């Protein structure tokens, strides 16, 4: 479990494989802080428990929980039959393995590497969500240790997992409203940043969507608006309601996507996901310590692509059952499962934002 | 802040003054563990916040909270105007300052001493409520440190504050169903135990009530059935409902009390407190991690006696307003205040079990 | 990673395989508390680092360190080339994986099980070394979790790994001066205890050595006086110096061993290990916080038996090089390595007391 | 213990009184992290213990130690007789109460206020010494809580206590090489900064010394080169050795000081302190974990001015006894005591950098 430091994945012959490709398991943290999760985080925990139990039927889950809520998580995972879910002890300031976590790589020859980015809590001292983010910056290194996989460290380059989507071949989907944000690499030019993404992902081309539905939190991550459902085909939220908060950004994205081609050349067969018709109304906001009824993001594009299955969010919206239908179209040969991950949407992020899959090898 | 060790309070000329006597302030901890408090303890916290804000108008409060929920408690106490309530950092396994806390003393000459007992979580490895109780056994010593008050250490003698009630002069009210319990000094005889209580409290006489309404938790503490409302006059729960769970123990106590005299000789003018007509039905028991609707104790005798005021529990029972009336009779020249401390009654103990007053001096 | 609970290893067809048998890796904790280790434990740490680096050349090491000294241990293990040593995050009250750790099992068909005993810090509230031992009682369960191996829980049966030595077939070496100690199963008869050892180890016979060289610490563990070097052949300390502190216990053991046969019937070809000629003189005892020059145990019998190698202690004694020679005789076809594990001998226990090997499978 | 927020000390009629003025006690933290202190910090601790025991004979000490090293500090302070030293529980990333701590104020009418600055570990993410500095930014607020003293919060203004020295009347001694450093208020002009110092200190004039002997650590704090020994008279290091590392900065300072007048008008009767002739050679640097023989600052100007006493550093240098003589001249009517605070000088800062006095009141 060492650290390669004199070369880049591109030279070393590694590449972040498509989320859809075959994978050994999934990694996910455990919510605890009252600063962000209501009611001692008990609800969110149960919400995490389910989203975990869901991956169960498709592959194993690596649930990492802080030492203080360990005995608990283990008593609840055994309470659910306890199949292929393992509880490993791991500290974190907040449960967002998608961002702070490791972004694995592969050389297509069996070896499994990884790229550990710098994490500053989505912004840092300039615009970060919370302050002490040092334990999260450890999560990526720690998880590569108990897995026996070397890693590349992008020094001074702060990037979070759920801000980039990739397809098997040299192409990635970033959101300039975030990667260019001043609280994220303001010493690097849009040119420099592309080069990095090309060296640590092995993407000969970077598609720049241009506004996000995460104005001031994640700073407009792309794992909320679109993604790659297959090398060439992609997903994307789309509504016609000209009075819906995500209308323009979504359409602006759709127009960009549909008019965009990838590396190998094929056009992007853009798909259509739906958006809620009623935003999640935060309740019991009083139990959220400070250092109600306010709207919180709830996107169906926040789904995880395991092998032979899909874990989709079900907020209990009107256009809910439609989401499960739409996703079904995209991945016909994949059982789709849905969970009430609405309770975690009150924390700013969904199913995708709380998982991280590890590509299988041999 | 040293430790006297070669003499006892009796010889040193000190005595635990009556709870009613003049006092400088009140000490209380902060609930946090999910093992005992539902919903991340958020509810219980608010319940503690109030019971705290209540003492506010009578004297200052010393709210000690673990380092992890400090910023929070301070943001909520300032949110309530922030008058004479100070938040000091202090770790604890559970919020029960009444038991683990220090039992102050006085020489009636200005000096303030204290007696630190051994705490084993109400029983210990034999019948304790929880296991790691080492941080609580620190609370008493820690609080005597930041107050500049020496202390006496009763080595190998495990006693908890809320298991004994005292009146100004040589007399204390203990409950043999607890002090004699095998999980509490099974190497000491009922004779030995009395001697200790006489040396560290300066009580020339010990009244032995004989069963409690705390069968298997606190093991029948006396701070649930009765207490001293004035040197000579006492309180005591009493119901005629021969089908009420506390009926016999309460009556058995009343008969004992009324037939009992104190040290100075005067008879005990026994009073009458009421009991709920409906036991607190524990709800949302699922959010209580394990290593619903079950009844939980709810006694009105669990009131704190500050100077010029009374803090009484209000569970929202039928015989509730009656309790406030009854207590009013006892302490006419004392403003009585009541708070919904029902949420903490779900943790096994009330207002009294969560406070600890420090007698003023000069 | 579940828990079998209605049957015992004997019925389930599992058995603790000989320490010498083939093994996948070795588990070991990380010293930190100033209550026991001098100079902030920095020395002991380096001593652990080496003993770890030593196993390196024979098999992989699983170094589990508390979250507070994690970054450190990883910076030091990479500083040593970083080969097959992985640092996993794990909390513990003290580094003694040998005792609190899991005692693996095998069905000789590929499956890997385990038996988790109760740990009370060698005695408990009656004679334990330290008080809070709850985090250590977690170590065994935690390590079985990140390894995907079920376990058996011996409820109310407190036993520590390094108090029993086993040989492939139905036989184990226990030390009655410990297993019978009142601070360890005083509700179980010597008959009952044997039955347990027979059900969770699959040993049809238990050899009872009868005094140990650990009078009041570990309470006379057997992993200090003797062990099984091969099914039938054993090791054992032996000196002729009638003025040496371990003289009689050692000889008393030798006489017992040599006159004892195992399960299958073969006689025990007793061997001879040497003892130091100069006891380790504890220095700088002042840096050891309390809640100098005193002697501390230093036994050469405290060696770990990895596959194709031996890790032996080298205190810098006169009969030191002799120890390496003696052990060499016993395991001719095994490279013997020695490390200055004298610094950890100041903590009460050696190389063996700080490791725990996991038998390989397929 | 509230927070005044709509007015400044200047308007409110408060002013940081001279360090020499009468004071109630002294506050100091407790070293623990292995990232900075060698040998588990055990040595530095003892060094802190002494420097603490020293203040003992002049006034009371408020020793705040993290919860993990509490029992220890209390066992050592009672081991020293235990006079007027109280151990209060308080977490911190590092022991430097001088900087992170509160900078008290007074209205000369009895009331005691304070000014809490922003702390970013001497620089922050730009040039800070360590990363997680959130617990230290709590120390100032926490200590004002257990003392019943309101405070002023300089939002977005990061200043550390030991970077400014004041004399009773409108004058302060800052070091531009630090207060202007880019990692400390690079959004504020030298004009703006002076105004702040004038509003929260009540100093109608700011003397700008111009280079420090702390090149890249504290970034040239002034509490290393000079200070106010009396309103008008000051101290200052001075050597003639043109080959001494502090030569020019010291002389450059002396020339500046001597040519400078204060607010009330009187000239500054500059004094002369000596510098070591041999820099402290860091030893045993290996026991200092990383995320030898190198020189470390050792200034005699790092002395604390209690009432009726002086605590001066004694590194065991050639010009050591001279320092005690020199300081003696300055404060004739003050008993001078010296302690081997060389062990803490290996951490970057001395006696002054680790204390914080609270001005008495009535």
From Swiss-Prot, chains A, B, C, D:
One of its GO terms (molecular function) is agmatine deiminase activity. Pfam families: PAD_porph. The active site is at 353 (amidino-cysteine intermediate). Gene3D superfamilies: L-arginine/glycine Amidinotransferase, Chain A. Keywords: Hydrolase. InterPro entries: Agmatine_deiminase (IPR017754), Peptidyl-Arg-deiminase_porph (IPR007466). Its EC number is 3.5.3.12. One of its GO terms (biological process) is putrescine biosynthetic process. It catalyses: agmatine + H2O = N-carbamoylputrescine + NH4(+). It is an enzyme of class 3 (hydrolase). The keyword Hydrolase applies. The keyword Transferase does not apply. Belongs to the agmatine deiminase family. This is Putative agmatine deiminase. It comes from Streptococcus mutans serotype c (strain ATCC 700610 / UA159).
């Amino acid at each position: 479990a060492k650290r390669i430091k004199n070369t880049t994945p591109k030279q070393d012959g590694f590449r972040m494989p498509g989320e859809f490709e075959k994978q050994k398991q999934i990694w996910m943290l455990w919510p605890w802080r009252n600063d962000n999760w209501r009611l001692g985080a008990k609800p969110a925990q149960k919400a995490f428990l389910e989203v975990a139990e869901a991956i169960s039927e498709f592959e194993p889950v690596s649930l990492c929980v802080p030492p203080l809520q360990y005995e608990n998580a283990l008593a609840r995972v055994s309470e659910l039959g306890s199949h292929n879910i393992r509880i490993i002890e791991m500290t974190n300031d907040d449960a967002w393995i998608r961002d702070c976590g490791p972004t694995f790589l592969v050389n297509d020859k069996g070896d499994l590497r990884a790229v550990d980015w710098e994490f500053n809590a989505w912004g840092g001292l300039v615009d970060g969500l919370y302050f002490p983010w040092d334990q999260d910056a450890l999560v990526a290194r720690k998880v590569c240790e108990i897995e026996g996989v070397d890693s590349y460290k992008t020094k001074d380059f702060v990037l979070e997992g759920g801000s980039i989507h990739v397809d098997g071949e040299g192409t990635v989907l970033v959101t300039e409203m975030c990667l260019l944000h001043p609280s994220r690499n303001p010493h690097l030019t849009k040119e420099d940043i592309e080069d990095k993404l090309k060296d640590y992902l092995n993407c000969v081309k970077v598609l720049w969507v241009k506004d996000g539905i995460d104005p001031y939190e994640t700073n407009g991550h792309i794992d909320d608006v679109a993604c790659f459902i297959r090398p060439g085909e992609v997903a994307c939220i789309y509504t016609d309601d000209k009075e819906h908060p995500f209308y323009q950004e979504a359409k602006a994205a759709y127009d960009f996507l549909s008019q965009q081609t990838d590396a190998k050349g094929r056009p992007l067969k853009v798909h259509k996901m739906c958006v809620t018709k009623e935003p999640c109304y935060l309740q019991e906001a009083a139990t959220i310590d400070y250092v109600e009824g306010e709207m919180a993001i709830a996107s169906y594009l926040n789904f995880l692509i395991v092998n032979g299955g899909i874990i989709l969010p079900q907020y209990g919206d009107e256009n809910d059952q439609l989401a499960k239908q739409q996703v079904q179209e995209m991945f016909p040969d994949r059982k789709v499962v849905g969970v009430r991950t609405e309770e975690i949407a009150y924390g700013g992020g969904n199913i995708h934002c709380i998982t991280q899959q590890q590509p299988a090898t041999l």
